[PDB]
Amino acid sequence: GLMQFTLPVRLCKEIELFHFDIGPFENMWPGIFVYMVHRSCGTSCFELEKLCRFIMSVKKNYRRVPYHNWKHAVTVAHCMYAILQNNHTLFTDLERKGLLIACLCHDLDHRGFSNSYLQKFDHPLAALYSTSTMEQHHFSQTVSILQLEGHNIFSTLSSSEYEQVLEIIRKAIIATDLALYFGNRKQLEEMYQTGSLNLNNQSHRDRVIGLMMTACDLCSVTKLWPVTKLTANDIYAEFWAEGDEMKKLGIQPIPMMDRDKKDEVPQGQLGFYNAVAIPCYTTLTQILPPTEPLLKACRDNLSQWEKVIRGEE
Numbered sequence: 001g002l003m004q005f006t007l008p009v010r011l012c013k014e015i016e017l018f019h020f021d022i023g024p025f026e027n028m029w030p031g032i033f034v035y036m037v038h039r040s041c042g043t044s045c046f047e048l049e050k051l052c053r054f055i056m057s058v059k060k061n062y063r064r065v066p067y068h069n070w071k072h073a074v075t076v077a078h079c080m081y082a083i084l085q086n087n088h089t090l091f092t093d094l095e096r097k098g099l100l101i102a103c104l105c106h107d108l109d110h111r112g113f114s115n116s117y118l119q120k121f122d123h124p125l126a127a128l129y130s131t132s133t134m135e136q137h138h139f140s141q142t143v144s145i146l147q148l149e150g151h152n153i154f155s156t157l158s159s160s161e162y163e164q165v166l167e168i169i170r171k172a173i174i175a176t177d178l179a180l181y182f183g184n185r186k187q188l189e190e191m192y193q194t195g196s197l198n199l200n201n202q203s204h205r206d207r208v209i210g211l212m213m214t215a216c217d218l219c220s221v222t223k224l225w226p227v228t229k230l231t232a233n234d235i236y237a238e239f240w241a242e243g244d245e246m247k248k249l250g251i252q253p254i255p256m257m258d259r260d261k262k263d264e265v266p267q268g269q270l271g272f273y274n275a276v277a278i279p280c281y282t283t284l285t286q287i288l289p290p291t292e293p294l295l296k297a298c299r300d301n302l303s304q305w306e307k308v309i310r311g312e313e
């Protein structure tokens with residue numbers, strides 16, 4: 001009850017900022033998360049003995065892949081933490097609990113391959129789930145861990161609060177399938193401008209949480225340039241591996257994934273920012289004004305990639 005987590009001053013200050021980088025020390029990331037849960041949710045939200053056991057089981061089930069790893073899980077959680085703190089009163093007690101956990105769990109047991117690569121490989125998980133493949137696998141894994149003895153961090157909730165929080169988390173994790181982002185934003189877009197967006201409409205909240213998750217999941221583009229620049233190497237390390245494996249199946253990969261075509265990256269990142277990230281954070285800022293900082297950083301980094309092409313770095 002009385003065992004606050006505290007952080008070094010720089011971390012304690014910098015963590016409340018959208019563009020915070022959790023840093024290269026694996027060993028602090030668990031404490032960082034618990035810090036965020038206590039300030040986001042309450043020191044009463046979860047039994048600490050239990051939370052710690054869940055955190056470490058969840059860490060154990062992210063794999064050693066260049067990008068879709070434990071560092072990604074916590075990065076995404078922090079970005080959600082930042083959004084909840086800047087929109088304090090808009091979100092229910094359970095929405096605060098379930099969302100941070102969803103973010104922590106959103107990529108459980110990712111292998112570094114896209115849904116497309118499961119289908120073309122004919123991986124068993126593509127047999128089992130025909131769309132949002134990995135994402136239903138990550139939700140599947142989150143319930144597996146939640147059901148291990150001593151890991152039910154949600155046990156103090158009623159039967160029905162429990163059914164709501166798992167249902168928040170499921171949609172939350174499906175929402176991170178970028179295949180669904182495009183329709184979800186276009187629907188939120190029409191609803192904000194026609195002016196029918198109603199946050200008391202639960203099908204509306206669902207979409208808005210869906211956008212937040214896309215925004216959190218994309219937040220390596222909302223960092224200081226030197227972070228965004230270096231994280232790009234990791235996402236691209238996975239892409240080129242997947243390309244290598246597409247080549248092995250007798251399939252030319254999209255250039256984005258072809259390591260013979262690195263020259264084409266700065267242009268590929270241009271497309272990405274314009275088609276995906278700028279729109280994501282635009283629509284999110286229009287809905288949740290305090291989240292503007294994420295749009296500014298995104299824009300900044302777009303500018304930096306233009307600069308890369310112009311020979312200027």
Ligand SMILES: CNC(=O)Cc1ccccc1NC(=O)c1nc(C2CC2)ccc1Nc1cncnc1
Nearest residue numbers: 178218220221228229231232235256268269271272
């Ligand atoms: C399916 N469609 C696409 O994936 C879009 C695209 C198109 C072309 C080239 C590249 C991409 N994608 C990305 O670059 C990218 N994707 C993602 C998530 C998988 C969506 C996250 C971060 C990205 N970049 C990134 C840059 N810096 C620091 N961190 C991450």
Ligand SMILES: [Mg+2]
Nearest residue numbers: 106107176177
């Ligand atoms: Mg994912």
Ligand SMILES: [Zn+2]
Nearest residue numbers: 106107176217
């Ligand atoms: Zn992710």
